[PDB]
Write an enzyme that holds these catalytic residues in place. Structure first.
Site, PDB file in Angstrom:
ATOM      1  N   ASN A 199       2.090   1.308   4.125  1.00 11.28           N
ATOM      2  CA  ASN A 199       2.503   0.059   4.793  1.00 11.28           C
ATOM      3  C   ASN A 199       2.282   0.078   6.318  1.00 11.28           C
ATOM      4  OD1 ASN A 199       5.478  -1.981   5.305  1.00 11.28           O
ATOM      5  ND2 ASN A 199       3.407  -2.644   4.813  1.00 11.28           N
ATOM      6  N   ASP A 256      -8.953   2.418   1.346  1.00 11.78           N
ATOM      7  CA  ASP A 256      -8.176   2.890   2.469  1.00 11.78           C
ATOM      8  C   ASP A 256      -9.121   3.175   3.648  1.00 11.78           C
ATOM      9  OD1 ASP A 256      -6.318   3.944   4.166  1.00 11.78           O
ATOM     10  OD2 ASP A 256      -5.558   5.476   2.766  1.00 11.78           O
ATOM     11  N   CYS A 305       0.833  -1.203   0.000  1.00 12.63           N
ATOM     12  CA  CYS A 305       0.000   0.000   0.000  1.00 12.63           C
ATOM     13  C   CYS A 305       0.870   1.257   0.000  1.00 12.63           C
ATOM     14  CB  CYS A 305      -1.083   0.018   1.107  1.00 12.63           C
ATOM     15  SG  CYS A 305      -0.566  -0.106   2.904  1.00 12.63           S
ATOM     16  N   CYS A 362      -1.558   0.376   7.262  1.00 10.10           N
ATOM     17  CA  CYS A 362      -2.967  -0.060   7.345  1.00 10.10           C
ATOM     18  C   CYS A 362      -3.230  -1.366   6.559  1.00 10.10           C
ATOM     19  CB  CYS A 362      -3.959   1.055   6.926  1.00 10.10           C
ATOM     20  SG  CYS A 362      -4.038   2.585   7.997  1.00 10.10           S
ATOM     21  N   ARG A 363      -3.605  -1.245   5.286  1.00  7.98           N
ATOM     22  CA  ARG A 363      -4.047  -2.398   4.486  1.00  7.98           C
ATOM     23  C   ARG A 363      -3.008  -3.509   4.251  1.00  7.98           C
ATOM     24  NH1 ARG A 363      -6.262   1.219  -0.384  1.00  7.98           N
ATOM     25  NH2 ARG A 363      -4.473   2.439   0.425  1.00  7.98           N
ATOM     26  N   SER A 364      -1.806  -3.160   3.794  1.00  7.08           N
ATOM     27  CA  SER A 364      -0.841  -4.205   3.419  1.00  7.08           C
ATOM     28  C   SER A 364      -0.373  -5.064   4.602  1.00  7.08           C
ATOM     29  CB  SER A 364       0.346  -3.660   2.585  1.00  7.08           C
ATOM     30  OG  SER A 364       0.944  -2.545   3.208  1.00  7.08           O
TER      31      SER A 364
END
Length: 154
Positions: free
Chosen positions: A12, A126, A9, A14-16
């Site tokens: 690096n 996000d 993301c 939140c999502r990934s």
């Protein structure tokens, strides 16, 4: 043959890191983590050294998943070493494609993680400006997509 996947993301945090920890749980519980190199990284330098967003951590703890990661930016080397680089949204993809064209050796297939969703949700949005429910949605998307990617890679 050891396989490798890199989740990506912008930051690096939140999502990934969630997708990474979700995948490392999948393979670990199927006794094959030894066969997989799993990691996550950011397209940008904003969060380098930072642990995952605390809200994501809290979400992961409710599902009993350990999430332990230090944010890092993607490198030229990642394109040569990873079989797969799976990102979250279209700007991630654009960025990665950009970097991939500066590099001699691109082994990595670069794809949206969402392109594996059985439910056809292409983008993993996000959750940064959202709430706990938005983190929960991200988690659920990751489970769906990772489970599908693990079964059969494009």
């Amino acid at each position: 043959a050891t396989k490798s996947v890199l989740f990506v993301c912008l930051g690096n945090i939140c999502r990934s890191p969630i997708a990474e920890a979700v995948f490392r749980k999948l393979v670990t519980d199927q006794n094959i983590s030894e066969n997989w190199r799993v990691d996550s990284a950011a397209t940008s330098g904003y969060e380098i050294g930072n642990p995952p967003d605390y809200r994501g951590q809290s979400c992961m703890k409710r599902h009993g998943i350990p999430m332990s990661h230090v944010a890092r930016q993607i490198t030229k080397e990642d394109f040569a070493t990873f079989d797969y680089i799976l990102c979250m949204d279209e700007s991630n993809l654009r960025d990665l494609n950009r970097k991939s064209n500066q590099v001699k050796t691109c082994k990595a297939k670069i794809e949206l993680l969402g392109s594996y969703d059985p439910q056809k949700q292409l983008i993993i949005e996000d959750p940064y400006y959202g709430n706990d429910s938005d983190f929960e949605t991200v988690y659920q998307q990751c489970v769906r997509c990772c489970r599908a990617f693990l079964e059969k890679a494009h």
